[PDB]
Structures are given as C-alpha cells and as structure tokens.
C-alpha cells in the first residue's frame, strides 16, 4: 500500500506518520532521524605545507672564476659574485688576494614532513545527503542508514522505505573549501600556479606524493659580507604559517543551522534544514483487520491542562465507549500539536490519557483514537523558564485557531462592528428607496 509523506529534517523530532487504509484499522508509524551526514564531492585542487629553504654550501672557486650554473628547481636562485675574500677559520681561504668567485645558490622545497602537517585545498561542488533513521511501527524498534536521494530503498521487516530527495539543496560549504586538520574553511584559495609570497599557498604541490612544487616565494640572494662565508638570503616567511595565524573563524564555528562539521570524510552533520519526503510500500501483514480492532464510539476531547512548553506540556484525556480491550493507534491529524505516544491501550472503562506538545495559545487539532475522531481544543499557558537544555518537540505553529479567546474577542468586536455597518447600509438603502418610489 503506497503512502507518501514528508517529515521535518530535525534530529530528535518524533514524527508520527498516520496511514489510514480503508477496510483496515488505522496504523500509526513513528520515526525520527538520529544523524544526517552531508558529504560533498571534492576535487583536490592542490596541497600546501610549510616550505623549507635548501641552501647548498657555496662553491667558492677562488683563484679562478665560477659561472652561474642555472637549474630548474622550484624558485631556484643562483648568483655569482666577484672580488670576494673568504676567511675560513685559521686564516685566508686561498693564496689569491682578489679575483675570486662565490657561487651562492638556494631553492625552495617542501618541508621534510608535511604528509602529516599539510592543508588540503579541495573544491567542492555537489552535496550528498546520508541519514540514519529510526522507525517504530508495531514492534520493530529498528534503525537503518539511508542515502537521502530517492533511489536508496531500505526494507525494514516487511515494509519498504524510500527517503526522497531533500526539499532544499542548501549546502553550508561554499564552492571552494580548505581543510587543514579538523576545520573546513570557506576560503577562496588562489588557483594553482598563482600563489603569492606570504599569504596562503605560496607553496603549492599538486598532491601529497607528487613533485611539482610551484614555489613562488621571493627567495632572493645577497652578496656575503667581506671576511665571511655565509650565503645570505631574504625569503618571505612561510606563507602557510601565516595562514595558520590569520586563518579566521573556521566554518566549524559559523555553520548555519547548527551543522556540526567533521573532517576526515568531510561532512556536515545534524544539518536542520528542509523536509525529507518519504514514500512507503507496506504489506497487508502489517495492518490490522477492522473486525478485530476494538471499535470506538462517542469520542470526546477534554484537555486537562495545556502549557505550550518546548517539551510535552499538555495532557488531554479522551472519553470513549469501546466494545473490548486492546491497543490501537492514535495521532493528531493537524500539526499544531504533536502527541508523545503513538499507540495507546484501550480499556473497557472509557478513559485514556495522552500527552501532547504545542506552540499555540489556543491549539485545535482533530485527535484520532483508533478509528474515530474528536475536534480537540484547549486554552494553553506560556511557561516561565526562558531557557531549556533540550530541543523543541513541536513544529513552531503559533497562529491560534478560530474560537480562541484571542480571535473570539476579535470576532466579537468585528461582529458588533459589522452589524453596525450593515444597519447603516440598510438605513441608507431604505432612505434611497423611499426617495425614488
């Protein structure tokens, strides 16, 4: 028996689908999500890690003349000087007084260890939902993992559930992200081969193991001071390190909708956005025959006390008149109220108590006990705590229903006002009529 419905995508919300097959006793079906990972597809644009300036020992070919032997190492720099007088410890370095050369050279290279300390620069384009859902119908108390796209079909002891695509395609990750160790920043990294010295990605490897190493870092050489054998250079510091200091607020602390962020399989969990359409195919075995379900007559609501608190802060008792004893489904057809229980036990004494939450001063919802109905109402109370540590258990429906004390007063003023307007209209028309005929 095909049945399609939509549940809110709020972790810890006890939704209760209420299937009503004609010729069968109505069946409630309570289900709730427990965690919803949101994995986007990635492309590893490049990988950045602290550089390391390799400085080979100068080749001081004095008493002669060396030449600039150029190379192709990343940001390779080779400089040749003249009129230089090395002063190695213990005396001069060679019998000549002048006409000497120093072949200073330096080139950038990836740090000896950044297989452990690199900051990927993925580029994410498309999301992919994945949720863990619990279903409680009859007695199955089961939890399953599904891919919320409309193609994964999970079978839970008979019944078959397909969780359609998410209503909204909202994704916290921007087009480009930067995953360092445990954070996924919404940065805009420079494209490969265009890193600037000092900022992010002055050093850009195509992959952790690959060796391309576009290393624009402004490594510049300078002539050694007389009487010494240094190889001075003026290189802008590790651009990657400066990114660590000025990374800014990581996405983990500004993700909308309270989306917790995890890293290794980069994902956003518990994203409370949109609705999850659900389509259900049910075998007849699950349902219950009408002739066997205890019949209910004279159903009546009477709300003992209602307090539209975040949790179940309203108790309503139903007075009925059954034929036998047993259990069968209950549910609130409207949405302004959400029942705590799904199946209630019906006894010969016509009294059953249900707990419901709500968010309206004057909620009104057609309760459905087993197979009957009863227009349900209440005059609710606002709690006094200002704060609770648990999430809501009620869709935020605050608009009252007609016959509420707020609207009833509005009806009273409008009704009296309307009668006054009608009376004036009738009087004017009568005046016009007698004037004419």
């Amino acid at each position: 028996y095909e049945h399609s419905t939509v549940m809110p995508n709020v972790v810890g919300f006890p939704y209760k689908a209420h299937i009503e097959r004609p010729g069968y006793s109505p069946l409630t079906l309570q289900m709730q999500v427990v965690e919803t990972s949101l994995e986007p597809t990635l492309n590893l644009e490049y990988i950045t890690c602290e550089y390391k300036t390799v400085v080979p020992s100068p080749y001081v070919k004095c008493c002669g003349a060396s030449e600039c032997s150029t190379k192709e190492k990343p940001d390779y720099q080779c400089k040749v000087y003249t009129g230089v007088y090395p002063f190695m410890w213990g005396g001069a370095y060679c019998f000549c007084d002048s006409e000497n050369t120093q072949l200073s050279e330096a080139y950038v290279d990836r740090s000896d260890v950044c297989r452990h300390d690199h900051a990927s620069a993925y580029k994410a384009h498309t999301a992919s939902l994945k949720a863990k859902v619990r279903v409680m119908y009859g007695n199955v108390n089961q939890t399953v993992d599904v891919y919320v796209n409309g193609d994964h079909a999970v079978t839970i002891g008979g019944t078959q559930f397909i969780f359609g695509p998410l209503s909204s395609a909202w994704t916290p990750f921007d087009n480009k992200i930067v995953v360092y160790k445990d954070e996924v920043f919404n940065q805009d990294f420079p494209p490969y081969g265009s890193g600037q010295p000092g900022r992010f990605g002055d050093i850009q490897s195509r992959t952790v193991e690959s060796n391309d190493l576009y290393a624009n870092t402004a490594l510049k050489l300078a002539r050694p001071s007389p009487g010494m054998v240094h190889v001075p250079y003026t290189q802008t510091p590790s651009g990657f390190k400066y990114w660590l200091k000025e990374k800014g607020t990581a996405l983990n602390t500004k993700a909308p909708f309270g989306c917790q962020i995890k890293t290794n399989p980069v994902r956003a969990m518990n994203c409370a956005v949109g609705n999850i359409p659900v389509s259900m195919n049910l075998p007849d075995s699950a349902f219950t025959r009408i002739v066997e379900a205890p019949t209910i007559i004279d159903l009546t609501c009477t709300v003992a006390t209602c307090t539209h608190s975040s949790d179940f802060g309203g108790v309503l008792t139903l007075t009925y008149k059954t034929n036998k004893n047993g259990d069968c489904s209950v549910h609130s057809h409207s949405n302004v109220a959400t029942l705590q229980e799904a199946t209630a036990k019906v006894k010969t004494a016509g009294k059953v108590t249900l707990h419901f939450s709500t968010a309206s001063a004057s909620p009104s919802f057609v309760v459905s006990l087993c197979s009957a109905r009863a227009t349900c109402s209440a005059s609710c109370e606002p709690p006094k705590d200002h704060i609770v540590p648990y999430a809501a258990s009620h869709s935020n429906v605050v608009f009252p229903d007609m016959s509420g004390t707020a609207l009833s007063w509005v009806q009273k003023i409008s009704g009296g006002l309307g009668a006054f307007a009608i009376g004036a209209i009738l009087v004017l028309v009568v005046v016009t009529c007698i004037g004419l005929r």
Binding site: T249, T253, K254, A255, P256, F257, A272, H386, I387
Partner: protein, 53 residues
Amino acid sequence: CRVPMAREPTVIHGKREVTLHLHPDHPTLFSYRTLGEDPQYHEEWVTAAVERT
C-alpha cells in the same frame, strides 16, 4: 596528548539570553553560534574572569 577541562560556567538564565560567569585560570577559548539561519558567531580568548552575555 593530555589537556585540562576548564571550569564549568555558572549559567544565569534570562529573557531570550544567558549571562555566563566565565571563571578561567589560563587563556581559553569561548565561541557561541546561534544555530538558526545566518548565525551570530563569536570567538574570543578569555584570560580573566568575565561576565559574557
């Protein structure tokens, strides 16, 4: 690697807001994000006793 767990703050409830009595003993972090839509994030290094709301 070991790391201490800072003193739990003394929450004070209020109309649509809290006022925490942060009681550190060494520089710690403190970040609160309004998990609604377009949050109001925040992140600061607390060095001494404060009364952040």
